[PDB]
């Protein structure tokens, strides 16, 4: 019975296949390929569908995979290059018909993303019971929805006793938003039946998609001997009661955003975990037990109760957080819990536990504790010789993903660009990735295009140069000067850019923009960089499109001035879904000067819980006459969940609303310090706890601001006083 066929055929013999057989695919890449599979082998004789060697079996193009039936093994596919039409790329079911007893094993999905990010889904669906999903690498989804489900529709799907065992769950990004768990078991409608499922020696690798590494949302699960290295997230006992999480690794390595365990419901046990280097807070912290809702509907947060938490190790841990939740909707704290025998060390001065409500609830019993303070804690023992040495390599040599699958620089070219019509244009096309175009002469470097970023691309101006090249839009149609497409990374230092606006031709539509539903992260570098001339209020002379996303945008040494809109725009995300566009935004060392609009504008709306970001950091900033229109703000930060601006100058702006705004959550972690405000907006905010640190109102003086140097002459009152002995505002 044992065929050696193409992946076409699969379909028609697999039908014809009887217990025992094996059915080689041919080495080969398909596209556009929609398998509907359908086989009945018994359990002493499975039916194997391998590749006839693993890792030559390429599936692309628009491409998916369904399967039902009994005893089936699907072994060594490659999903790339492709994206699925309609449901996951892989589904345990086929029509009405459900998988059981089959295995998907040593196959890999990899960047099998479409081209616009405006779209949801998932990778992989288990349906059915007693199915296995072993030794695959994951990695590289793009787009909102969990990577792999446990559906629990229908009776035949629940108390499945799925196997989620040896996979590789690789990178996945910041998704800004909901919806970007690795793994997720169970819905809240069906959070009280029983799953089954076991998660075990499973590596998640890089999982930052949101909060929830894996959503556990069902009952009585096992998440066993897994490993979580640096994943900016955490295991989420969301739904469901009585789950069972032994064994496993939460290494963080001291990276941000890294979590561990979070608790609601009742009846679990949390015994013999490591939580080694988590810098996580709030719903990222290493460990979390919410506080809940009396008579919790089955969507919102059901009490904790009947938790033994034993044998765990909290290994420089920051964050242990008890009642974690706790506000005017979650006032029931947890019930019946039990510390037993747990390690925490720790080399920094953190609390040892954080409670945000009464812990009478807790019983703690014969645990020890090595934290550079005394604990005096009924229950906890100190002990100052145990070392917060541990060997993590166990953790590291498990086998795990695909057994055949392995796995931003300059090239060093450099292209020089003349001024000209088009001359950065065309220097632009012939560059590869990697490659430096450098303007090597001053004047005006027309365009009549927009450049566009489909590669990773470094624009500067030539370092012999006294002056700015000058960019100038001469198009018959809007465009922005820079667009950043899919698979664009852009560093750019140097460069004016005026949008004046040419006789009988287009307005350019802003300086650097990126398209909107640009679905691969992006770097973007702003270094030394003029805007100006843009007289309309609605354009930015940087901006961060709707759906899309970058983990880190670096502005710096940039000069903002005469626009009618706004400098640095990251506020796309309208619809208050929790949605935003940036996980990191540094401003350094900026001139904002003369703008209608703000000098900076991020939001993230709603009450969603689900992310970290944006973080946000404003440092040395010199904003004078900027936005003085009722309500306007020149510094808008809504839904900015860390933010730090410091030694700052505002002078003449947000004088008809605010030089700051925020609409801020109790815990968002803000701290405005060492601003000069001068005939400016206040600080404004809702809770008005910013504070106060070195909130100065002297008047400032620049060198020259007609000729743009708005340093401080070395007599003013700026000089010397922001925390770093630099200048308020601009300096050195
Ligand atoms: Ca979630």
Redesign the pocket.
């Known amino acids: 019975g044992n065929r050696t066929i193409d992946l076409n055929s699969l379909q028609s013999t697999l039908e014809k296949a009887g217990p025992g057989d094996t059915i080689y695919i041919k080495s080969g890449t398909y596209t556009n390929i929609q398998l509907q599979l359908e086989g009945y082998g018994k359990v002493e004789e499975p039916i194997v569908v391998m590749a006839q060697q693993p890792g030559s079996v390429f599936i692309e193009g628009v491409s998916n995979l369904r399967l039902c039936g009994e005893y089936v093994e699907i072994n060594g596919l490659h999903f790339r290059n492709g994206y699925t039409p309609k449901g996951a790329v892989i589904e345990f079911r086929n029509g009405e018909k459900v998988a059981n007893n089959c295995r998907i094993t040593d196959c890999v999905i990899d960047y099998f993303n479409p081209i616009d990010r405006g779209v949801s889904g998932s990778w992989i669906l288990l349906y059915g019971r007693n199915n296995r999903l072993d030794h695959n690498s994951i990695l590289g989804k793009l787009y909102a929805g969990v990577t792999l489900a446990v559906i629990l529709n229908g009776e035949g799907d629940r108390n499945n006793n799925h196997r989620i065992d040896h996979n590789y769950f690789g990178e996945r990004p910041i998704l800004g938003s909901?919806?970007?768990?690795t793994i997720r078991v169970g819905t809240s409608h069906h959070a009280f039946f029983s799953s089954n499922t076991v998660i075990e020696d499973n590596m998640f690798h890089h999982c930052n998609g949101?909060?929830?590494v894996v959503?556990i949302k069902s009952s009585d699960n096992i998440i066993r001997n897994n490993v979580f290295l640096e994943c900016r997230g955490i295991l989420?006992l969301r739904h469901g009661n009585r789950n069972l999480v032994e064994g496993n690794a939460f290494i963080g390595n001291g990276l941000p955003c890294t979590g561990g365990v979070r608790i609601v419901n009742e009846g679990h046990t949390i015994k013999g975990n490591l939580f080694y280097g988590l810098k996580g807070d709030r719903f990222f912290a290493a460990l979390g037990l919410m506080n809940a809702v009396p008579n919790s509907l089955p969507n919102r947060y059901h009490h904790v109760k009947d938790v033994t938490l034993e044998d765990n190790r909290f290994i420089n841990c920051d964050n242990i957080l008890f009642c974690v939740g706790k506000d005017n909707e979650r006032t029931l704290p947890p019930s019946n819990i039990s510390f037993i025998r747990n390690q925490f060390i720790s080399k920094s001065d953190k609390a040892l536990y954080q409670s945000f409500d009464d812990i009478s609830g807790f019983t703690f019993i014969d645990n020890v504790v090595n934290y550079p303070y005394t604990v005096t804690q009924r229950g906890f023992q100190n002990n100052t010789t145990l070392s917060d040495s541990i060997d993590l390599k166990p953790y590291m040599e498990k086998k795990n993903g695909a057994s055949w699958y392995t796995l931003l620089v300059l090239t060093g070219n450099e292209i020089s660009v003349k001024a000209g019509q088009n001359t950065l244009l065309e220097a632009l096309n012939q560059a590869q990735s990697g490659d430096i175009l450098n303007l090597s002469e001053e004047g005006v470097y027309w365009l009549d295009n927009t450049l566009l970023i489909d590669k990773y691309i470094r624009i500067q101006a030539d370092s012999h140069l006294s002056k700015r090249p000058v960019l100038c839009f001469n198009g018959m149609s809007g465009k922005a000067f820079v667009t950043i497409v899919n698979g664009g990374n852009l560093e750019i230092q140097g460069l004016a850019f005026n949008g004046e606006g040419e006789a009988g031709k287009a307005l350019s539509e802003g300086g650097i923009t990126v398209k909107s539903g640009t679905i691969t992260p992006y770097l973007l570098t702003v270094d030394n960089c003029e805007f100006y001339n843009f007289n309309e209020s609605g354009l930015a002379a940087i901006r961060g499109e709707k759906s899309t996303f970058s983990p880190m945008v670096i502005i710096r040494n940039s000069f903002f001035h005469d626009m009618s809109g706004e400098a640095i725009n990251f506020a796309g995300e309208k619809d208050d879904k929790g949605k935003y566009n940036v996980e990191e935004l540094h401003v350094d060392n900026c001139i904002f000067y003369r703008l209608l609009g703000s000098a900076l504008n991020i939001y993230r709306g709603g009450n969603d819980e689900?992310t970290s970001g944006p973080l946000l950091t404003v440092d040395h900033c010199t904003i004078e006459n900027v936005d003085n229109k009722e309500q306007g703000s020149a510094m808008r930060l809504i839904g900015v969940q860390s933010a730090t601006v410091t030694n700052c100058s505002f002078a003449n702006s947000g004088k008809g609303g605010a030089s700051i705004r925020f609409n801020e959550m109790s815990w968002d972690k803000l701290s405005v310090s060492y601003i000069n405000l001068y005939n400016s907006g206040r600080i404004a905010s809702f809770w008005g706890k910013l504070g106060s640190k070195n909130i100065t109102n002297y008047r400032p003086e620049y060198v020259d601001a007609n000729t743009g140097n708005f340093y401080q002459i070395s007599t003013s009152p700026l000089s010397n006083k922001a925390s770093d002995k630099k200048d308020l505002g601009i300096t050195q």
Not at 178 to 181: K, L, R, S, T, V
């Open positions: 909901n919806g970007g768990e949101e909060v929830e959503s989420a689900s």
